[PDB]
Design a protein around this nucleic acid. Structure first.
Ligand SMILES: [K+]
Ligand SMILES: [K+]
Ligand SMILES: [K+]
Ligand SMILES: [K+]
Ligand SMILES: [K+]
Ligand SMILES: [K+]
Ligand SMILES: [K+]
Ligand SMILES: [K+]
Ligand SMILES: [K+]
Ligand SMILES: [K+]
Ligand SMILES: [K+]
Ligand SMILES: [K+]
Ligand SMILES: [K+]
Ligand SMILES: [K+]
Ligand SMILES: [K+]
Ligand SMILES: [K+]
Ligand SMILES: [K+]
Ligand SMILES: [K+]
Ligand SMILES: [K+]
Ligand SMILES: [Mg+2]
Ligand SMILES: [Mg+2]
Ligand SMILES: [Mg+2]
Ligand SMILES: [Mg+2]
Ligand SMILES: [Mg+2]
Ligand SMILES: [Mg+2]
Ligand SMILES: [Mg+2]
Ligand SMILES: [Mg+2]
Ligand SMILES: [Mg+2]
Ligand SMILES: [Mg+2]
Ligand SMILES: [Mg+2]
Ligand SMILES: [Mg+2]
Ligand SMILES: [Mg+2]
Ligand SMILES: [Mg+2]
Ligand SMILES: [Mg+2]
Ligand SMILES: [Mg+2]
Ligand SMILES: [Mg+2]
Ligand SMILES: [Mg+2]
Ligand SMILES: [Mg+2]
Ligand SMILES: [Mg+2]
Ligand SMILES: [Mg+2]
Ligand SMILES: [Mg+2]
Ligand SMILES: [Mg+2]
Lengths: 55, 69, 117, 153
RNA sequence: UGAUUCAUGACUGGGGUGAAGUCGUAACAAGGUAACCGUAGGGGAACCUGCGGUUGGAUC
RNA sequence: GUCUCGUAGAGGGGGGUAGAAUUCCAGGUGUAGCGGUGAAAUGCGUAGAGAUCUGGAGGAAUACCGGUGGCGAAGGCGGCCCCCUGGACGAAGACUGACGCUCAGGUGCGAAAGCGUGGGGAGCAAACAGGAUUAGAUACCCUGGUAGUCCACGCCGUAAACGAUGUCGACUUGGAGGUUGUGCCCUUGAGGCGUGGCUUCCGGAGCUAACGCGUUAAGUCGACCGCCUGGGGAGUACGGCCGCA
């Protein structure tokens, strides 16, 4: 299960600018891609991850 | 796209790196698509047309790989 | 009149014009030039060459401050995105950083209607 | 043309000096196929120029050609939208052809007594960077400079 | 005192047919601003404009 | 059809919150242009604009993820969090015992625009004004801009509301995919063998005027309903019902 606190894992699925990388590029299953997107949005809200690279 | 020119790195190389990073970020296409409002029916029509074109081109390539000219 | 030696060049590259403004690191402007103001109007104003001329004029305008190092912030999709940077490097400044700062709404306001030409 | 099948035509060198450059100049000056008349006019003008200056006929002619030769011209280019006057580099053969044509036209426009005298005066003015065909080279260069912003179409 | 039905009425509304006079050129090709649907506002006229919708759109 | 365990989902209603961006306000730096177009002009700017930095106000929409992906009867539904809540699907059972299908009239839901009352109003923008283009230009282009778009409650009841394809059930060769369950096996992983739900493209027989449809049928059958009967007049008139219009 994807954890929004697992910043090290989550950083593999974001670009340098902070955007969420497409599953067609990362080879991720769709069901797990949705969980990744939710976790990344939660982490952004908690400021564990940036919304944009201009931070 | 934040490109920090490292030491002894030529300006031309730094500029090419910046251009590549901008192209990978796709900011230009985003701005161009945000210049004017696209009605939701228009957006749906365009997405469907792109998907249909991709599928038809792939099928045509598959068929053409098995024939001689 | 005070020396800075560490400045930021902001390029505003729109489809119709290029605006080059050199500030210090705190955002206070020292000088500016524009492609429209460097003797170009109409279709000539929106070319990379006009942007390069504007960049040269801005460098000349800030020559007094003795700026040595320049960060670069480019904003907009205009044709003067790279000619300005090339001219700034050719003018003698040391290009330390290059960054894209083009604003992107995360949705945002509804854009103007499409043109029927 | 469409098919790109046009070669090149050899030109005999001029009698007095054996210069295809001067032979082409005579050809440009010639009207109605009166090549002997054109040659006599050119020779008289060249002798007047040589006695006016300290150089030979060929050297004075080369000085005038160097002063009249253009480097960049403007040509129309029509793309999606409107037509632009794009500056284009001129190849050496066209440089020579344009220089000769402009010199001949300026001399014909002059109002002296004889055509040989007009040509000699035009050549001397060209050597001193004065008069017509020099103003013409200047106008062409000015147009190219004004349209330099379009040098990527 | 009502209802219904027939006839008739200054004037007025649109409709059909004929004929082609005046004004434009809306549609058919990407018909020269893709067309059309519902709705709303505007305009001598065909129509134009906004909002959502459709492909029964050419090119890509 | 009920119960038990679990699964995915922008299904619905209510509340809160986050970041980006636009506009406006104030201040700092700074100076002659900005903006716009095919080219211009209107417009904005030395009363200091545009550009850049800082702080504040406010409304609306939620980049990337995102997908011939998902959910929903249809209309439709997209940041994150909580609360209330509907449906679907799968595995083993247990339970009821034809309790079913369809449905005139009736009733409910029903995009956008529009209407009423009260709020709100950043951006956009019918009407309107000016600048252009043009023979003209009540347009297309440009500069502005009001209803409206937003919120609450009520009305309206229409759309190329489309798959131009009513609902329910049974049966009839195949291929390649997507998505979501679940069983077994192995050397244990982008593993192999099955078995369900929903879904995209191609195509066989058959069907079809043809185009095409083709197990999600427009094939082969049954049950019930809605509808058509040459073009125009016309979905118009008159009458009824409904509606504030
Ligand atoms: K009566
Ligand atoms: K009567
Ligand atoms: K039209
Ligand atoms: K059409
Ligand atoms: K309309
Ligand atoms: K009128
Ligand atoms: K739920
Ligand atoms: K919200
Ligand atoms: K019944
Ligand atoms: K209101
Ligand atoms: K508003
Ligand atoms: K506007
Ligand atoms: K409500
Ligand atoms: K209505
Ligand atoms: K449809
Ligand atoms: K499956
Ligand atoms: K399976
Ligand atoms: K009603
Ligand atoms: K009313
Ligand atoms: Mg615009
Ligand atoms: Mg036109
Ligand atoms: Mg029509
Ligand atoms: Mg027409
Ligand atoms: Mg027209
Ligand atoms: Mg049209
Ligand atoms: Mg109607
Ligand atoms: Mg109008
Ligand atoms: Mg306000
Ligand atoms: Mg539930
Ligand atoms: Mg009924
Ligand atoms: Mg509405
Ligand atoms: Mg009204
Ligand atoms: Mg209202
Ligand atoms: Mg307002
Ligand atoms: Mg407008
Ligand atoms: Mg209807
Ligand atoms: Mg629909
Ligand atoms: Mg229908
Ligand atoms: Mg479904
Ligand atoms: Mg088929
Ligand atoms: Mg049929
Ligand atoms: Mg009616």
């Amino acid at each position: 299960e994807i954890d929004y606190k697992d910043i090290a894992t989550l950083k593999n699925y974001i670009t340098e600018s902070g955007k969420i990388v497409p599953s067609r590029i990362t080879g991720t299953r769709a069901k797990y891609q949705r969980q990744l997107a939710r976790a990344i949005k939660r982490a952004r809200y908690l400021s564990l991850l940036p919304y944009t690279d201009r931070h | 796209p934040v490109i920090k020119v490292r030491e002894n790195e030529p300006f031309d190389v730094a500029l090419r790196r910046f251009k590549r990073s901008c192209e990978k970020a796709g900011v230009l296409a985003e701005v161009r698509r945000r210049e004017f409002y696209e009605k939701p029916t228009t957006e749906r029509k365009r997405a469907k047309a792109s998907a249909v074109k991709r599928h038809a081109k792939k099928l045509a390539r598959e068929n053409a790989r098995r024939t001689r000219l | 009149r005070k020396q800075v030696s560490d400045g930021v060049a902001h390029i505003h590259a729109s489809f119709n014009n290029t605006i080059v403004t050199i500030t210090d690191r705190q955002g206070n402007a020292l000088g500016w030039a524009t492609a429209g103001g460097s003797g170009f109007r109409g279709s000539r104003k929106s070319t990379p060459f006009a942007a390069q001329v504007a960049a040269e004029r801005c460098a000349d305008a800030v020559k007094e401050y003795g700026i040595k190092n320049l960060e670069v912030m480019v904003k907009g999709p205009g044709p003067g995105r790279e000619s300005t940077i090339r001219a700034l490097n050719a003018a003698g400044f040391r290009i330390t950083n290059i960054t894209d700062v083009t604003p992107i709404p995360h949705x945002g306001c509804r854009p103007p209607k499409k043109r029927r030409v | 043309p469409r098919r790109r099948v046009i070669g090149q035509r050899k030109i005999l060198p001029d009698p007095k000096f054996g210069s295809e450059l001067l032979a082409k100049f005579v050809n440009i000056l010639m009207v109605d196929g009166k090549k002997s008349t054109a040659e006599s006019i050119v020779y008289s003008a060249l002798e007047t120029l040589a006695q006016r200056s300290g150089k030979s006929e060929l050297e004075a002619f080369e000085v005038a050609l160097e002063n009249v030769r253009p480097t960049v011209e403007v040509k129309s280019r029509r793309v999606g939208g409107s037509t632009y006057q794009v500056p284009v580099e001129v190849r050496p053969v066209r440089r020579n052809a344009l220089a000769m044509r402009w010199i001949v036209e300026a001399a014909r426009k002059r109002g002296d007594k004889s055509m040989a005298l007009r040509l000699a005066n035009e050549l001397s003015d060209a050597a001193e960077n004065k008069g017509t065909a020099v103003k013409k080279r200047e106008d062409v260069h000015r147009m190219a400079e004004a349209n330099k912003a379009f040098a990527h179409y």
